[PDB]
Write a protein that binds this ligand. Structure first.
Ligand SMILES: Nc1nc2c(ncn2[C@@H]2O[C@H](COP(=O)(O)OP(=O)(O)O)[C@@H](O)[C@H]2O)c(=O)[nH]1
Ligand SMILES: [Mg+2]
Length: 158
């Protein structure tokens, strides 16, 4: 079966572990050790296709050169994580030695009212990279499937 290796990157505390657990395990984690950096697998039906998703959930503390898709995650109530989005894009290009990496920018925690990063603000950065932008909430599952599935399709075009 078609297997897709996805990599979740972004500053700590933006919800990288919660988005994977919501997608894979279908529930919301209130806490997840920031130093756990593991793979997580689940067979899914994307637009109606049996794909095997191998997701690597990264941490500050498991190969990324082999990842074919990267979700770049910040939180809408964390400017600092939005400002660091550029560092991870440069690390993706470095580790893949190409400026043509299938990639999706994700604004997590959009269930929170104390928002700082604006939508057009994130959309402008997305058009800067030529990549889609999807607002997600690991707590409500909002856009969670759309974030990951868009990446596979971005892989499917590449
Ligand atoms: N309200 C809300 N909280 C979230 C969301 N996603 C993650 N969190 C919380 O943010 C905290 C850090 O998330 P975590 O997945 O461990 O961060 P990371 O793995 O370092 O990126 C956790 O306590 C989550 O409960 C979300 O969509 N909405
Ligand atoms: Mg974590």
């Amino acid at each position: 079966m078609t297997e897709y290796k996805l990599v979740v990157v972004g500053a700590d505390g933006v919800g990288k572990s919660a988005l994977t657990i919501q997608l894979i395990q279908n529930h919301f984690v209130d806490e997840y050790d920031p130093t756990i950096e593991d793979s997580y697998r689940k067979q899914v039906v994307i637009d109606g296709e049996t794909c095997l998703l191998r997701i690597l959930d990264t941490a500050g503390q498991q190969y990324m050169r082999t990842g074919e898709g990267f979700l770049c995650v910040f939180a809408i109530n964390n400017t600092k994580s939005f400002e660091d989005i550029h560092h991870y894009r440069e690390q993706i290009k470095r580790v893949k030695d190409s400026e043509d990496v299938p990639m999706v920018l994700v604004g997590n925690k959009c269930d929170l009212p104390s928002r700082t990063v604006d939508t057009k603000q994130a959309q402008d950065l997305a058009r800067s990279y030529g990549i889609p932008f999807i607002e997600t909430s690991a707590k409500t599952r909002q856009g969670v499937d759309d974030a990951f599935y868009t990446l596979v399709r971005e892989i499917r075009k590449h």
